[PDB]
Design a protein around this nucleic acid. Structure first.
Lengths: 184, 258, 134, 171
RNA sequence: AUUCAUAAUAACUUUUCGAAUCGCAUGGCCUUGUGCUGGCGAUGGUUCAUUCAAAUUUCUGCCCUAUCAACUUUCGAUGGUAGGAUAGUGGCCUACCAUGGUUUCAACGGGUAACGGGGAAUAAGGGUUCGAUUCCGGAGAGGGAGCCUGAGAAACGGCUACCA
RNA sequence: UAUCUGGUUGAUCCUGCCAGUAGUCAUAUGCUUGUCUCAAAGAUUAAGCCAUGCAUGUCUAAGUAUAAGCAAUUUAUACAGUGAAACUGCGAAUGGCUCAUUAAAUCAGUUAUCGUUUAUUUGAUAGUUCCUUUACUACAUGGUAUAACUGUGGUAAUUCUAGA
């Protein structure tokens, strides 16, 4: 038969599931970033854990080791390209300093909210999932879509959406028909 | 298994064919031929996966059966004919021309060739012997059998074979300084110069090689292929003249070519 | 389609099958999609060939509409196209007709039934008829 | 009864099993090398039979209609050249391309005689192949002989050059 | 490294092979005849070589059990020599002979809810458990044996017998 | 991300296990159920038993075709195309399934064939084919059979087959 299609999990549920401090902290993140489940928090924390593990390995590696330089350069480059890290904090230890709120801040939800297209983060998520936002020029409706540090210049309303200059939607169009019929 | 094997599955196939892992379950099992089942590029993969001149096994069979493809000097129609290291694949219909050769990563390059160099090939004799009626003869790594070779030739020297008629044209002897092309192991695709050999009794022979960057390495003799004198090959070389860059150097070159 | 401006990339020529093959994309803003006929006629006129001589397939409409990408294959003659394309694609293009082979199970049943008969069986048919009458 | 054929050679009036093999009657091997345990009745005639197959080795003095009285043709005429030759009693030089049986066949009103092809027929193509074989073999022999001569001269020159090298040695 | 490659002598062989095959193309030469020569191939064929293999084989490594301590040697056990046999090494088998071989560094025997590996899960480090299963290698077609064809089979979507 | 917590006591410090917690390309099951991608799936007990239907056949220009087949010899009186059937050559010994048997067995890494066989592919490679030794040889090519087919049959029945 066929070669196996590989797959893996993207999150790690916590040990000690019921620390009241962690539950309160993660709900604060969920409320202020408009997340749907704790799964998102777990995924970002799993992601941050993976990056921090790699960065710790490479930071205890000897200086100007070929492996350290190559791997560290790649790690920081994708970090700054996604924009989670910042070019002033170019050194490797700043990755250890990173927190889950930083990745959440670069999620598509919050970038739409920060660019002002959204009334709030929850209004932002509704807008994203209803195919009204677009990056580059293409409709994207994954709220977790990471935005590179160059695509903020392209995030705005989708050309197919009524908020992007397209056809006047469905319910407005239906209500317009009703108004014309009632005036007819 | 109570007979010869007649199938190959993509995970079993050698990696240096760069076959993808999710396009069907089976792989083209290179039919018996002049080269090993490994270290041999079938025409099916060569045309479809490297040149992209045909998208299907069906289309590749069409190419082969209209005889636009001829390997070395002879027209071949075996869809999985095992073209090997030094094989010259002609493609006269498009007036293309290639010689198989390894890039420095260890994969058969798409190295195009000119006709004055497609008319001939190199061969590292794997043994010298006496045939019947007292005829001394040699066989190359390609299985090509050449009678009455030059008596100064020994094993593992290099023959220059004409595709018009397989015959001794000249030979390069295996000693220090000769340019070598490492065919296999962890240094597959490397090019360098011999500095000296070990000559293990009974054990595998070993030769130490240093190249133009002085990135010396060591490789078994069953794995080397002398192809000319210092910095002057008997063929053209693929991209980069067999130099291997570090991972850092490769990233730099990609960034500089961006 | 409005502002198709069909673009063709990687246009490598193969004299082996005597055609030009390229990765084709079509931009169709404000329209759902473009079809085989509308793609083939435009490709035919831009490549200086008959409508049948050019073949296109593998069109995946990219998310949000707007554009799709398929694979284009323009032959050097109608005869070349007839010889080289698969019969499914020809009948797809409408040039050819669907082969009337029976289903696999009925077809395989025929093989195994005729496998039980050695030779023509004309003598056997006569003998079976004589015995059945008897 | 039950239709078991009476095998030739088996000397008993009963039904017996045999591991019937190729080139033997009563059984046709479906796969090469195959052997099957069939049942065959003996060659000794007995009451068990339902039919007896008889062929007349000398005709009586009165006629049977389904017999000597009437005849059927040899359905096919000879197809090999020499078999045509023996059938017509021909000599060495007699032609066969015109003694082939032009057996008639009429597809509706379309009549024609599709006569058998002739095998082993002397034809210039075969002579061309034979002469080509002769030239091929003699060419190979000549080429092999001349190449052996060249290497012999080369090895002789190698001997001379080594002798000159030893002359350079030894002062 | 060889009694190797290969060559040379004397014979033997119930004798293998060395082409009575096939398609296209039909060109040259004249002493013009169905004359002599001719191309591109396909198929086939001995030996060598290659390739795909195959069979043996060196070394090292395997879970639990002493409530298994001695085991193997009738009629193969360890080995010698000679022969059969094998495609071929070999107690593989036969014949004569010697009395050896393994073991507390766990032989031998029993259990395995045991196909082996690449690997999987989970771990600071060490590790613990799992791997029937997509790849590799084994073994089987209900049990067991025997065997035809072939290059390749103990073949089972092949035969033979017994068993169920 | 090298972490512990509840339980023996009136109360304490311990050994100590029970319980908790988290993971499982780890099984089953309960409740519940919108979408996309991907996707395992009669291994576990029974390598227990199997109805039925399929799963190995195959032809080009290039082995043999007078089907009493099809269209035409618009190329032909030996064949000329195409083609059923059939003989012939290959293949059916790969794949697919399962893990029952097997604890130095398999398998893993590593070896050797100076110890053997190998269809096929690849490359070479038969003046001695007069050999009983120049007609055993007709060499512009030798001989024999038998399928396919026709016709008579037998058996309730088989992918049975006899006689001519």
């Amino acid at each position: 038969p066929r070669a196996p299609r590989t797959y893996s999990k993207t999150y790690s549920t916590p040990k000690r599931p019921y620390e009241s401090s962690r539950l309160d902290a993660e709900l604060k993140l969920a409320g202020e970033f408009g997340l749907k489940n704790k799964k998102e928090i777990y995924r970002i924390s799993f992601q941050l854990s993976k990056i921090r593990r790699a960065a710790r390995d490479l930071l205890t590696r000897d200086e100007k080791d070929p492996k350290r330089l190559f791997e560290g350069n790649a790690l920081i480059r994708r970090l700054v390209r996604v924009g989670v890290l910042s070019e002033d904090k170019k050194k490797l230890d700043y990755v250890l300093a990173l927190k889950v709120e930083d990745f959440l801040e670069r999620r598509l939800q919050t970038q739409v909210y920060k660019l002002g297209l959204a009334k709030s983060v929850h209004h932002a998520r509704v807008l994203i999932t209803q195919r009204h936002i677009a990056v580059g020029k293409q409709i994207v409706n994954i709220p977790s879509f990471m935005v590179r540090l160059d695509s903020e210049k392209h995030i705005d309303f989708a050309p197919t959406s009524p908020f992007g200059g397209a056809r006047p939607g469905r319910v407005a169009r239906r209500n317009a028909a009703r108004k014309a019929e009632a005036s007819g | 298994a109570r007979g010869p094997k007649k199938h190959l599955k993509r995970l079993a196939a050698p990696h240096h064919w760069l076959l993808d892992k999710l396009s069907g379950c089976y792989a083209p099992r290179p039919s018996a031929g002049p080269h090993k089942l490994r270290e041999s590029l079938p025409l099916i993969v060569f045309l479809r996966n490297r040149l992209k001149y045909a998208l299907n096994g069906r289309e590749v069979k069409a190419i082969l059966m209209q005889r636009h493809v001829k390997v070395d000097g002879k027209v071949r129609t075996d869809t999985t004919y095992p073209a090997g290291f030094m094989d010259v694949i002609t493609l006269d219909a498009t007036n293309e021309n290639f010689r198989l050769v390894y890039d420095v990563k260890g994969r058969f390059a798409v190295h195009r060739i000119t006709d004055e160099e497609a008319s001939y090939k190199l061969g590292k004799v794997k043994k010298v012997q006496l045939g019947k009626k007292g005829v001394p003869y040699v066989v190359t790594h390609d299985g090509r059998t050449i009678r009455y070779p030059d008596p100064n030739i020994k094993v593992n020297d290099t023959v220059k074979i004409d595709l018009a008629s397989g015959k001794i044209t000249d030979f390069i002897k295996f000693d220090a300084g000769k340019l070598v092309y490492v065919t296999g192991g962890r240094n597959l695709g490397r090019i360098g110069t011999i500095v000296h050999k070990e000559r293990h009794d009974g054990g595998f022979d070993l030769v130490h090689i240093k190249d133009s960057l002085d990135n010396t390495f060591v490789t078994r003799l069953n794995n080397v292929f002398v192809i000319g004198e210092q910095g002057k090959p008997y063929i053209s070389l693929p991209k980069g003249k067999g130099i291997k860059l570090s991972i850092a150097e490769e990233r730099d070159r990609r960034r500089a070519q961006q | 389609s409005d502002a198709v401006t069909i673009r063709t990339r990687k246009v490598i020529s193969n004299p082996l099958l005597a055609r030009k093959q390229f990765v084709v994309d079509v931009l169709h803003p404000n329209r759902a999609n473009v079809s085989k006929d509308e793609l083939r006629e435009k490709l035919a006129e831009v490549y200086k060939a008959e409508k049948d001589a050019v073949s296109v397939f593998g069109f995946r409409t990219q998310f949000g509409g707007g554009k799709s990408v398929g694979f284009g294959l323009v032959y050097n003659s109608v005869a070349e196209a007839k010889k080289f394309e698969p019969t499914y694609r020809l009948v797809r293009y409408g040039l050819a007709e669907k082969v009337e082979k029976a289903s696999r199970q009925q077809r395989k049943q025929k093989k195994n039934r005729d496998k039980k008969i050695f030779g023509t069986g004309k003598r056997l048919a006569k003998k079976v008829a004589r015995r059945n009458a008897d | 009864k039950q239709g078991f054929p009476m095998k030739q050679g088996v000397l008993l009036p009963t039904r017996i099993k045999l591991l019937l093999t190729k080139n033997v009657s009563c059984y046709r091997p479906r796969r090469d090398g195959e052997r099957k345990r069939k049942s065959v009745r003996g060659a000794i005639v007995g009451p068990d039979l339902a039919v007896l197959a008889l062929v007349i080795v000398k005709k009586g003095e009165q006629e049977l209609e389904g017999l000597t009285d009437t005849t059927v043709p040899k359905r096919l005429g000879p197809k090999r050249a020499n078999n045509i030759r023996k059938f017509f009693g021909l000599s060495k030089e007699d032609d066969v391309r015109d003694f082939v049986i032009r057996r008639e066949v009429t597809k509706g009103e379309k009549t024609y005689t599709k006569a058998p092809k002739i095998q082993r027929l002397v034809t210039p193509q075969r002579l061309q192949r034979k002469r080509h074989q002769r030239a091929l073999k003699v060419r190979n022999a000549q080429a092999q002989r001349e190449a052996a001569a060249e290497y012999a001269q080369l090895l002789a020159k190698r001997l001379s050059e080594r002798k000159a090298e030893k002359a350079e040695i030894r002062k």
